[PDB]
Design a protein around this ligand. Sequence first.
Ligand code: FMN
Ligand code: CA
Ligand code: CU1
Ligand code: CU1
Lengths: 309, 136
Amino acid sequence: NYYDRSVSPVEYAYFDQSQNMRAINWNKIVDEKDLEVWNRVTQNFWLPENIPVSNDLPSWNELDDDWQQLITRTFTGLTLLDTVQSSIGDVAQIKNSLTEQEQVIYANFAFMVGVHARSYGTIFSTLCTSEQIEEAHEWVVDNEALQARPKALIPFYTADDPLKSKIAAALMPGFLLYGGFYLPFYLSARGKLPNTSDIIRLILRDKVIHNFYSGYKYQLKVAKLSPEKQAEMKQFVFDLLDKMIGLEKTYLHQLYDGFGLADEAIRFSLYNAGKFLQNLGYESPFTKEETRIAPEVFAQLSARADWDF
Amino acid sequence: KELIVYFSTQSNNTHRFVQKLDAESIRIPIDEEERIKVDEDYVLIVPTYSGGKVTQVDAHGAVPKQVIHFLNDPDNRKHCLGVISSGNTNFGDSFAIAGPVISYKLKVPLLYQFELIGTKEDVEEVNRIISETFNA
Ligand SMILES: Cc1cc2nc3c(=O)[nH]c(=O)nc-3n(C[C@H](O)[C@H](O)[C@H](O)COP(=O)(O)O)c2cc1C
Ligand SMILES: [Ca+2]
Ligand SMILES: [Cu+]
Ligand SMILES: [Cu+]
């Protein structure tokens, strides 16, 4: 069989030049889950241009300068995390792929997280001034608590431990941005910036699959390690999440300082930390109570919260 | 005679949730060439795979094809006491919508909704709801 005596180009390029290269085979698929994910993320393609946030101007102009600045700062902070994941995180996963299709799916992830980062620009272009925009960028660069979070993850992407790189790749869409995503849902529960929330919901529809897929591939790799190394990787995950929860809490208490949103934002963050663990195959230690947010804010996330007959 | 019929893809999230429950469970096969016969009353537990499609919510593919094939057999259909559905709230208005779709098609109660492999509380609650469903 050609497949067992050949390597994918990315394997050839970075790991093994002793074998000839095989073209991707979409006709004989190793893992049907890859086809399931590829079909959904490509069929779910969208651009921020096709959501008109001009209809948010009325509700935006009613907000005072402090709230407008909070929104601009929060979203520029999320832009940084998407820039990290698009330019470093998702592309770094390509060479560590178990399957050929996975290599192309992570190329889609990198592009679409790029679209996420671009979408915040579309919102700012419509609502904010040139001064408000540059102020948010200055604020992100000089915010040490903000900078600490991506600075903690990037080393895993550039280092030579594929499993630790994969955990980081799941943690970004699985956890790190939800502290910020609380704000648009909080506002849309008060009928404020409703079209902005439609962009957030399209972003979440991508990130939920990104977290699932990175988590799915992590579980397939760790399952091949000895029981000892599996226990070591589980300890690393809980230790890394503990550290990242610490940095996120520090950041959100500064971000939401004087707005009183930090408590709910952190509970929403921990809710998603629980789902991050579950999609890595580990039990969530968080209770229903300590991950609870206001029903009206959760309603903005989800209102839901061949047949022969 | 407490019994669960469930479906789970290769990711085995729904499988792991069901194996934590008290009641005996039977898996609907992933392979579309394979079918099962169930001749005892069961609660159906299934994940959602519509992928947050919008036309308004597009419920196409919410119910996996293997679950449709299973329910299409009227011998299997008649034994369903109710449906529990799973998914992820980050799919928004498409969250766990396999449940409502099956609830409507079968005329059976939507008993519960959960996420991924479920929490301690989900196990506790689903154990109780299944016990009450079979007793009542
Ligand atoms: C391609 C894809 C589409 C999905 N679509 C939905 C959806 O429309 N609604 C939802 O609540 N969850 C959705 N999910 C989340 C899954 O239902 C969730 O991961 C579930 O735990 C999978 O169960 P399984 O591992 O037993 O197949 C989707 C997941 C994938 C990979
Ligand atoms: Ca999921
Ligand atoms: Cu602004
Ligand atoms: Cu992502």
